[PDB]
Amino acid sequence: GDKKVIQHLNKILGNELIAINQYFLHSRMWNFWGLKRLGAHEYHESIDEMKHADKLIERILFLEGLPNLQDLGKLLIGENTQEMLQCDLNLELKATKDLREAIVHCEQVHDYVSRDLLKDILESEEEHIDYLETQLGLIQKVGLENYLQSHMHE
Amino acid sequence: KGDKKVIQHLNKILGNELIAINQYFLHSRMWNFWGLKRLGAHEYHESIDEMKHADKLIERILFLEGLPNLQDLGKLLIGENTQEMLQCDLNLELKATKDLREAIVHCEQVHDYVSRDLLKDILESEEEHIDYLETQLGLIQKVGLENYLQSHMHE
Amino acid sequence: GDKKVIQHLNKILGNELIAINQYFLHSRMWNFWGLKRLGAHEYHESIDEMKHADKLIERILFLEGLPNLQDLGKLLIGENTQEMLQCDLNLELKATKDLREAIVHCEQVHDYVSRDLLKDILESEEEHIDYLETQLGLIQKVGLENYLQSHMHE
Amino acid sequence: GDKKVIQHLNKILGNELIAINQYFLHSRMWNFWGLKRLGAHEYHESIDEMKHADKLIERILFLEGLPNLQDLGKLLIGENTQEMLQCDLNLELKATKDLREAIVHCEQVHDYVSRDLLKDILESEEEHIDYLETQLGLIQKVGLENYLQSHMHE
Amino acid sequence: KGDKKVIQHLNKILGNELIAINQYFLHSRMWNFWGLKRLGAHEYHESIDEMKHADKLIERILFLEGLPNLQDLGKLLIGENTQEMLQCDLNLELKATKDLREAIVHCEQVHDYVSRDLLKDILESEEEHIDYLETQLGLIQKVGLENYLQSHMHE
Amino acid sequence: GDKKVIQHLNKILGNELIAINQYFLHSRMWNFWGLKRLGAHEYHESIDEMKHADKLIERILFLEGLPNLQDLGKLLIGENTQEMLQCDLNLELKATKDLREAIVHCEQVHDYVSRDLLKDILESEEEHIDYLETQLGLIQKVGLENYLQSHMHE
Amino acid sequence: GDKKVIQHLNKILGNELIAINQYFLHSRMWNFWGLKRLGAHEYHESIDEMKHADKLIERILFLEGLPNLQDLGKLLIGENTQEMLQCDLNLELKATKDLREAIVHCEQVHDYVSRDLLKDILESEEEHIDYLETQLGLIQKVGLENYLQSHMHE
Numbered sequence A, C, D, F, G: 001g002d003k004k005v006i007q008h009l010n011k012i013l014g015n016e017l018i019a020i021n022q023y024f025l026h027s028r029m030w031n032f033w034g035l036k037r038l039g040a041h042e043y044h045e046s047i048d049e050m051k052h053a054d055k056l057i058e059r060i061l062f063l064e065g066l067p068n069l070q071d072l073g074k075l076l077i078g079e080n081t082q083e084m085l086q087c088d089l090n091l092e093l094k095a096t097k098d099l100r101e102a103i104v105h106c107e108q109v110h111d112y113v114s115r116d117l118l119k120d121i122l123e124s125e126e127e128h129i130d131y132l133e134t135q136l137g138l139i140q141k142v143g144l145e146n147y148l149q150s151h152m153h154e
Numbered sequence B, E: 001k002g003d004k005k006v007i008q009h010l011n012k013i014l015g016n017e018l019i020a021i022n023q024y025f026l027h028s029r030m031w032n033f034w035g036l037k038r039l040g041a042h043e044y045h046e047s048i049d050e051m052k053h054a055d056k057l058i059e060r061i062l063f064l065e066g067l068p069n070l071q072d073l074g075k076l077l078i079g080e081n082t083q084e085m086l087q088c089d090l091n092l093e094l095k096a097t098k099d100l101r102e103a104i105v106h107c108e109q110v111h112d113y114v115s116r117d118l119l120k121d122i123l124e125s126e127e128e129h130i131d132y133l134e135t136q137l138g139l140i141q142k143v144g145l146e147n148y149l150q151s152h153m154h155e
C-alpha cells in the first residue's frame, strides 16, 4: 500500500465525515422546521456520505493503512435554507477538488482500483453539486417562499 | 383506595382533555367548512387523541375509586382564523403540560407509579402536539400565510 | 340561516353533548364493574351521540351560526344499573321533545334540509328509547341479578 | 296528478336544464384554460343536474303531465373563474327558492312522494351552494392566483 | 456490580412471584377440578404471567451479579371456595404491590433506572390483576354467588 | 383415593417442584454466560417438569387429596457447567428412585391409572438422564472448551 | 428548554458520536480480519448509536437548543479482539454514568419526556454492556482461539 495514496484516502474520508454530520444536522433542522421534503432529501445525502466513508475505510484497511475517524474538520452549518444549501455546496466543491488530486496520485502509482473507487465517489459528488445548484436556481426562478412551500410535504 | 390528591390531579388533567376535545373538534370543523381540509383532518385527529386520553383517565380514576368529573367544562379557546386557532391550541397545550407536570410530581411523591406512567404517556403526546403547533406557526412565517393555507386545502 | 333555527340546532347540540358525557361515563362504570356487555352497548350509544353532534356542528356552520360547545347541561349519573338506565331514559325523552319543537320551526321557515337532519337524529333517539325501555322491562321479567349476569361477558 | 304540483315540477326541471348547460360550458371553459381540476368538478356538478332532471321527468310522466324540455331559461355565463363561480351561486340560490315553494305545494295537496324527491334534490343543491361559497371563500383566503394554481392539475 | 440493596429488593420481589405462581396454579387446578373452567383458565393465565415476571427478575439479578433466590418459598394462601380463593389472591397482590413500591423507591435513590422501569412494568401488571380480583368480588355481590359460578363453568 | 398413593404422588410432585426451579435457574445462568444452546435446552427441561407437576396436581385432586405446592426441597445449584450438569443428574437419579417406589405402591393397591401416569413421567426422566450422561461424556470426549464452544450459539 | 438539560443532552450526544465511529471502525477491522460475525454484530451496535444520536438531535432541536456534532472526543481503538471489546466496554461504562446524571437533572426540573428518552437509551446501553461482558467471559470459558473461530462465519 502506497503511503501517499493512503494519506489521500484518509483525506477523502475526513471530508466524508464532515459531510455526514453537516448533512444530518441540516436534515433534522429542516424536519424540525416542517420542511420535510428537504429534510428527507438531505437525510439521503447523509446516508450516501456514510456509504462512501464505509468503502474508504474498507479500502484503507486492505491497503494496510490506519483509517482516521478521529479528526473531524469544520462543519459548515447554515441558519436558513439558502445558507444551508450554499454551505453544502461549498463543502462539495472542496470535496471534488480533493478527489481530483487523489485520483492523480492513484494514477501515478498505478493504484487503479483505488482510482476507480474514488471516481465512483466523484460521480456521486458531482450529482450532489448538480442537486444543490439546481435548488439555488429554483429559489431564484420560483421565489424563496414558493420553493419552501413545495418542500413542506413529502 | 387511591390517594385523594392524585385523584384530584387526574380529574384536573381530565378537565383539560375535555376542553381540548371540544376546542379541537370545533376548530377541525371550521377548517373543513372553509375548505382547508388538510388542517381540518389533522385537527380532527388531534381531537380523537384527546378523547383517548380522557378515556384512559376516566378508567384510572374509577379504578382508584374516585368520581370522574365530566360535568365541569372549562373555557374553550376558539379562534376565528387559522393563525388564531393554532395559537389558541398552543395556549391550551402549554397550560395542559404544566398541569401534567404537577400531577406527575404528586404521583411520584405518594408512590403512585402507574398513574405517573399514564401521565407521562399523555405528556409525551402533548409535547408532540406542541411541536406540531409551533412548526405550523413557524411555517406560516417562512412560506407566507396564503401559501400555507393553500398547501392545506387538499388532502 | 334563520336565527331561530340556529338556536334550535344549538339546543339539540347541547343535548347531544350531555348525552355524550353521560353515556361515556355510564359505559366506563359498567366496564369497571365487570358488566362489559352493558359497558360496550353504552359506549356505542355515546359514539352515536358523538356522530349526531358532528352533523349538527356542520349544519350550524353552513347556516353561518356559531356552534356552542361551551355550555354543558346537567349530566344524570346513576349509581347502579337500574338508575343509570333510567337516567339515560330521562335524558332521551327530554331530547326527543326538543327535537320535535325544532322540526316544527324548521318546517315553518321552510328549512327542509335541517328538518330532515333532525328527523334522522330523532329516529335514532327513538331506537335508543326502545333499547332503554326494553332493558328496564327485561329487569322485571328475568330479575335484576339474571339481567346483570347476562351482561357480564361480551 | 295535481296540475299545480306538475307545474312546480316543470319549473324545477327548467332550472335543472339551465344548470346543466351553464355548468357544462363553465367546465369546458375551465378545461380549455388548463384549470382541469375546476373543470372536472364543474363537470360533475353538471352530471348531477342531469340526474335530477331525469328524476323530475320520470315523476312528471307518472303524474300524467307533460315534461317540458323545450323552454330553456337564461344561462349565467361568466368570463373568469370568480364570475363563473358567482354565476353558479346565483343560479343555485334561485333554484333553492323555487324548490322550497314547490315543497310547500306538495305538502298542501298531500303529494308526499313528490315532496320527498324535491327535498332530496334540495339537499344536493345546498351541498352545491356550500361548494361554491367555499371556493369564493378560498379565493379570499389564499389569493386568486394561488387558488387557480391549486386547480390546474387533477 | 449492581447495588446490593437493589438486588435484595429484586430477590424479595422474586420471592413474591414464586408464591403467586404456585398459589395461582393450585387455585386454577382446583377450579378446573370443580368444573369452573372459565375461572380455572383465567387463573392459569395469571400464574403464567407471574412465571414471566419471575423470569425477568432472574435475568436482571444475574446481570447485576447477584444470586437469584429460588429456594425460599413463603406462605401460599389457599382458599377452600371461590370467594376465599379470590380474596387470598387479592391479599397476596396487595402485599406484592407494597413491596414493589418500596423497591422502586430504592432503585430511584441509587439511580438504577433500568431496574425501576422493570419493576414499574411488573407493578402495572399487578394492579391490572388487583382490578380483576376486586371486580370478580364485586360481581359476586351484584349477580349473586350461584349465578357468578354458573357464568364461569364453561369457557 | 388411597392415602399412601396420594403421599407418593405428593412426594413425586415435590421432586418436580425442585427440578422446575433448579433447571430454570441453571437455564438462565447458562443464558447469562452466553451458552445459549445449553440454556435453551435446560429451559425445555424445566418446561417438561412443569408439565409433570401439572398432571400430578390434577391426579391428586381427582383422588381427593390435597396437592402440596408449599414444601420446596433443596435445589442443587452448580457454579459451572460440569457441576450444573452433575447436579441435575443427581436430582434425576433421586427422582427415578422415588418414581419406582410410587409405582410399586400403585401396583399393590391396583391404582393402575396412577401407575401409568408415573410410568410416563419415568420414561421422560430416563430420557433426561440419558441427555445428562451424554453431555458429561461429550465433555470427556471433545474437551470442556470445545463442548462449551459448541453450545454458545443456538 | 432548560439550558442545563440541553447541555446534558449534548453531552450524551457527544458520547453517541464517539461510539458510532469506534464501533464502526472496530466492525470494519473485524471484517477485514475475516471475523465476520464479530464485525456484523459490531456494525449493528454502531447503527444503534446512530439511532440514539438521531433521537437526541431531534429532542435538542425541539428544546430550542443547538445540537453539537462538531466536537468528537477520543476513540478507544484496540488492536486485537480482546482489547477492542474492553475499549467498547470502557466507553459504555462512561456513557451510562453520564446518562444517569442527565436523568437526575431531567427529573429535578420536571422534563419527564427527556428523562424517558434517556431511560430508553440507557436500557439499550445496559444491553450493550451485557453483550460485551458476556463476550469477555466467553473468551475465558472457551479460550480465545475457539472464541474467534466461532465468530469467523456469519
Ligand code: HEM
Residues within 6 Å of the ligand: B018, B021, B022, B025, B048, B051, B052, B054, B055, B070, C017, C020, C021, C024, C047, C050, C051, C053, C054, C057
Ligand atoms: C367526554 C367526551 C368524549 C369522550 C370521552 C370521547 C371518546 C371517544 C372515543 C374513545 C372514541 C373512539 C376513538 C378511537 O379509538 O378511534 C371517539 C370517537 C369519536 N368521537 Fe368522541 N369522545 C368525546 C366527545 C366527543 C365530542 C364532543 C365529539 C363531537 C362534537 C366527538 C366526536 C367523535 C367522533 C366523530 C368519533 C368517531 C366516531 C366514528 O365515526 O366511529 N367526541 N370518542
Ligand code: HEM
Residues within 6 Å of the ligand: E018, E021, E022, E025, E048, E051, E052, E054, E055, E070, F017, F020, F021, F024, F047, F050, F051, F053, F054, F057
Ligand atoms: C420458578 C418458577 C417458574 C418459572 C420461572 C416458570 C417459568 C415459565 C415460563 C417462562 C413459561 C412460558 C410461558 C410463556 O411464555 O408462554 C412457563 C410455562 C408453563 N409453566 Fe412455569 N414456571 C415456574 C413454575 C411453574 C410451576 C410450579 C408450574 C406447575 C405446577 C408451572 C406450570 C407451567 C405450565 C403448565 C406452562 C405451559 C407449558 C406448556 O407450554 O405446555 N410452572 N413457565
Ligand code: HEM
Residues within 6 Å of the ligand: A017, A020, A021, A024, A047, A050, A051, A053, A054, A069, G017, G020, G021, G024, G047, G050, G051, G053, G054, G057
Ligand atoms: C463514521 C461515521 C458514520 C458511518 C461510517 C456511518 C455508516 C452508516 C451505514 C453504512 C449505514 C447503512 C446505510 C445503508 O446502507 O442504508 C448507516 C445508517 C444510518 N446512519 Fe450512519 N454512519 C455514520 C455516522 C452517522 C451519524 C453521525 C448519524 C446521526 C447523527 C448517523 C445516522 C444514521 C441513521 C439514522 C442510519 C439508518 C439506520 C437505520 O435506521 O437502519 N450515522 N450509517
Ligand SMILES: [Fe+2]
Residues within 6 Å of the ligand: A031, A032, A034, B131, B132, B135
Ligand atoms: Fe417535528
Ligand SMILES: [Fe+2]
Residues within 6 Å of the ligand: A016, A019, A048, A049, A052, A121, A125
Ligand atoms: Fe461522499
Ligand SMILES: [Fe+2]
Residues within 6 Å of the ligand: A004, A008, A101, A102, A105
Ligand atoms: Fe498527491
Ligand SMILES: [Fe+2]
Residues within 6 Å of the ligand: A116, A117
Ligand atoms: Fe469499479
Ligand SMILES: [Fe+2]
Residues within 6 Å of the ligand: A019, A049, A092, A124, A125, A128
Ligand atoms: Fe457529497
Ligand SMILES: [Fe+2]
Residues within 6 Å of the ligand: A151
Ligand atoms: Fe424538490
Ligand SMILES: [Fe+2]
Residues within 6 Å of the ligand: A153, B152
Ligand atoms: Fe402540513
Ligand SMILES: [Fe+2]
Residues within 6 Å of the ligand: B032, B033, B034, B035, D130, D131, D134
Ligand atoms: Fe363544506
Ligand SMILES: [Fe+2]
Residues within 6 Å of the ligand: B017, B020, B049, B050, B053, B122, B126
Ligand atoms: Fe391530551
Ligand SMILES: [Fe+2]
Residues within 6 Å of the ligand: B005, B009, B102, B103, B106
Ligand atoms: Fe399536588
Ligand SMILES: [Fe+2]
Residues within 6 Å of the ligand: B117, B118, E124
Ligand atoms: Fe406504560
Ligand SMILES: [Fe+2]
Residues within 6 Å of the ligand: B020, B046, B049, B050, B093, B125, B126, B129
Ligand atoms: Fe393534545
Ligand SMILES: [Fe+2]
Residues within 6 Å of the ligand: C031, C032, C033, C034, E131, E132, E135
Ligand atoms: Fe376493569
